[PDB]
């Protein structure tokens, strides 16, 4: 009966880092997806296993929305089967992923002349992430695999920071990303189209 | 990690026909939009055709409309580019691409909107 709170995830004031991406479950509401594909600022609006223009005609068991911020050159890694430090150590999509990837430039927010370094990403890990797996740990990394503490050699903090400055090119400016997942279980449909 | 590999290139006389194909090893392209790009000698890579994951929508460049037809068989994990009435201006190396089903026509050109790209196969017409 209610409208699905898409404005609460797409226009939330703050966004999390990619290594600690956050998921919101959308359920028991009516989703008028034209609120999204009528917008003009979405720099990437691609879907997998479904067309966005036919989203208003469909019904799903649930809808999941993941939020995080990459830099421009890293948006390409939010795709099924992709490789790279974001797709392997931060946020990975399965190859049979059914949903949409949404991203828009946010340099007026999240980017400063001083330089916003608050957004982090993991660049060191023992093994790739599984699809939709999360790794929020911050333990010093060693290629050896044994415990080490930072000042020693061959010991590194596994989280690196983004450098969002208001003077860089769009490849280094920050982008807010929303990944929509459409679930189809053998259960009643709780998220449908407008009418 | 997706590996796109083309097939079916070769030589044919002007006006003849030729069919290309492309697939991935084990990687299910059923949810991916598939398409074709073109690298004409001396010019940069340009768009040719694209087809959505379920074929509900296909697209062609104006230089190509009517003569080429793109299709796919998700059961075989393969996209095809049927090229008829080939002109000497079609001589190029053709590249296969896979990516998301963009709401807009970002599939048209903008090769970076596609996530993957094959290694190319040469087609020459005389």
């Amino acid at each position, epitope marked *: 009966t209610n409208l699905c709170p898409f404005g609460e995830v797409f226009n939330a004031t703050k966004f999390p880092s990619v290594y600690a991406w956050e998921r919101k479950k959308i359920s028991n509401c009516v989703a008028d997806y034209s609120v999204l594909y009528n917008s003009t600022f979405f720099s990437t609006f691609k879907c997998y296993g479904v067309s966005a223009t036919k989203l208003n*005609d469909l019904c799903f068991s649930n809808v999941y929305a993941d939020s995080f911020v990459v830099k421009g050159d890293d948006v390409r890694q939010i795709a099924p089967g992709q490789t790279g430090v974001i797709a392997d150590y931060n946020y990975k999509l399965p190859d049979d992923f059914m949903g949409c990837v949404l991203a828009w430039n946010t340099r007026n927010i999240d980017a400063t002349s001083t330089g916003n370094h608050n957004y982090k990403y993991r660049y060191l890990r023992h093994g790739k992430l599984r699809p939709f797996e999360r790794d929020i740990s911050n333990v010093p990394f060693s290629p050896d695999g044994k415990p080490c503490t930072p000042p020693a050699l061959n010991c590194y903090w596994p989280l690196n920071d983004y450098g969002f400055y208001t003077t860089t090119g769009i490849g280094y400016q920050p982008y807010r990303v929303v990944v929509l997942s459409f679930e189809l279980l053998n259960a009643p*449909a709780t998220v449908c*189209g407008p009418k | 990690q997706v590996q796109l590999v083309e097939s079916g290139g070769g030589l044919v006389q002007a006006g003849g026909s030729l069919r290309l194909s492309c697939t991935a090893p084990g990687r299910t392209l059923k949810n991916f939009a598939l398409g074709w790009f073109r690298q004409i000698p001396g010019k940069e890579r340009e768009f040719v055709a694209a087809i959505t994951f379920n074929a*509900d929508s296909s697209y062609y460049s104006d230089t190509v409309k009517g003569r080429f037809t793109i299709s796919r068989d998700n059961a075989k994990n393969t996209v095809y580019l049927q090229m008829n009435s080939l002109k000497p201006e079609d001589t190029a190396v053709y590249y296969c691409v896979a990516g998301g089903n963009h709401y807009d026509s970002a599939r048209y050109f903008s090769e970076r909107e596609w996530d993957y790209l094959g290694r190319g196969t040469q087609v020459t017409v005389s």
Partner: nanobody, 129 residues
Framework: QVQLVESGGDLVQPGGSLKLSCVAS????????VGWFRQAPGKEREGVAC????????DIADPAKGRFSIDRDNAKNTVYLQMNILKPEDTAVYFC????????????????????????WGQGTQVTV
């Protein structure tokens, strides 16, 4: 698998109004494009109405336009067909049929309304005008 059961068919007089109900037993109907069809003696089965999975896109056949309307209640697992100013030519057994939404969106336009499409069928209810 989804099972369909039609109801509400009855005998009415010309100019009457009948509401047909298509309740889905077993599988949930919210994941299916639903269409309403009718068959009669001497008459090949024809499409009458169809709705998308959500009801966002609907269609009415030419002989039924302005008189028949389609609606659905996914919470109730039901698709309704509202028929007004019924004519004696509308006398037929009316079936409802479903097709998985992901298969239905492959086709352009609103739903389908074609007998070859929609392969899961109910057994129908009788409408006599």
């Amino acid at each position: 698998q989804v099972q369909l059961v039609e109801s509400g068919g009855d005998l009415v007089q010309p100019g009457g109004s009948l509401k047909l109900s298509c309740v889905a037993s077993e599988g949930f109907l919210a994941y299916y494009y639903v269409g309403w069809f009718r068959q009669a003696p001497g008459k090949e089965r024809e499409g009458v109405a169809c709705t998308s999975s959500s009801g966002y896109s609907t269609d009415i056949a030419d002989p039924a336009k302005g008189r028949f309307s389609i609606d659905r209640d996914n919470a109730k697992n039901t698709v309704y067909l509202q028929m007004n100013i019924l004519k004696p030519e509308d006398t037929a057994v009316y079936f409802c049929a479903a097709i998985d939404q992901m298969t239905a969106v492959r086709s352009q336009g609103p739903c389908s309304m074609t007998p070859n499409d929609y392969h899961d069928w109910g057994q129908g209810t009788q409408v006599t005008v």
